[PDB]
From a paper:
Protein O-mannosyltransferases (PMTs) are conserved endoplasmic reticulum membrane-embedded enzymes responsible for the transfer of mannose from dolichol phosphate-mannose (Dol-P-Man) to serine/threonine-rich protein substrates or unfolded proteins. PMTs from three subfamilies form obligate dimers with different substrate specificities and require the concerted action of their transmembrane domains (TMDs) and a luminal MIR domain for catalysis. The core fold of the TMDs and MIR domain is conserved with the Pmt1-Pmt2 heterodimer, indicating a shared catalytic mechanism.
Therefore, in order to be able to compare PMT2 and PMT4 family MIR domains from the same species, we additionally purified the scPmt4-MIR domain and solved the crystal structure to 1.3 Å resolution. Characteristically, the Pmt4-MIR domain structures reveal a unique β-hairpin insertion (β-ins) of seven residues (RY(D/E)(D/N)GRΦ) in β2−β3 of MIRm1. It is fixed on top of the cap scaffold by hydrogen-bonding of the tyrosine (ct: Y368, sc: Y362) to a glutamate (ct: E441, sc: E434), and of the centrally-fixed arginine to the mainchain around a proline (ct: P434, sc: P427) within MIRm2. As observed previously in the PMT2-MIR crystal structures, the Pmt4-MIR domains are extensively bound to small polar ligands present in the crystallisation solutions (acetate or HEPES) or cryo-protectant buffers (glycerol or ethylene glycol). In particular, the α and β sites, which were demonstrated for scPmt2 to bind O-mannosylated peptides, are again occupied by ligands in ctPmt4-MIR and scPmt4-MIR respectively, in-line with the expectation that they are also sugar binding sites. Furthermore, the ctPmt4- and scPmt4-MIR domains have an asymmetric surface charge distribution with both a highly positively and negatively charged patch.
Author numbering: 334 to 537
The structure:
Amino acid sequence: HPMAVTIDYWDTITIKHKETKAYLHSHPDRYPLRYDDGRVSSQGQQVTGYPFNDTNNWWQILPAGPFEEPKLGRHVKHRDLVRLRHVGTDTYLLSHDVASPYYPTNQEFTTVSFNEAYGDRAADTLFEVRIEHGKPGQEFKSISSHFKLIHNPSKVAMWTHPTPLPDWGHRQQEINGNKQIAPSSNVWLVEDIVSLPADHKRRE
Ligand code: NA
């Protein structure tokens, strides 16, 4: 497929849910302190699934360890640990054992600052890219690498479903951590390497 290209660290990408077609998304709005059932959220930045194309779908895929200046040509591979930086808010994807908006059993997904992501909350910002049918050393590619995104501390899978969030979440889809990895509803794909120009050698 001409749009199936190996993804490199520091690329900016869009991440699309295979079954619902929603894009992984974020924006400045926060989770409410209390849900209707009385549970308490982290009040962190919302992470949602959004059906349309906009800049709030853009995430930069980054390495898992200490901060380093950008390098070119470092391919992401099956089962690598990664961070995902939301470009529009300059925050870092995080999950933790706080119950999600609609599923008391599933982990909340949110974002955190650079200082948190490379400091005391670093472990909670690491996610494994588990390619469906992946083999050791296999390169992660746009379009063709269907994958599950596994939170490294807890082994929950990033998940979504169709029933929209309330108005506080802009009636977008919930994103949370599924305790079961096997379901096909845990499958995502990278639709576009946004940062990689159309004339770049990597597309040849
Ligand atoms: Na582009």
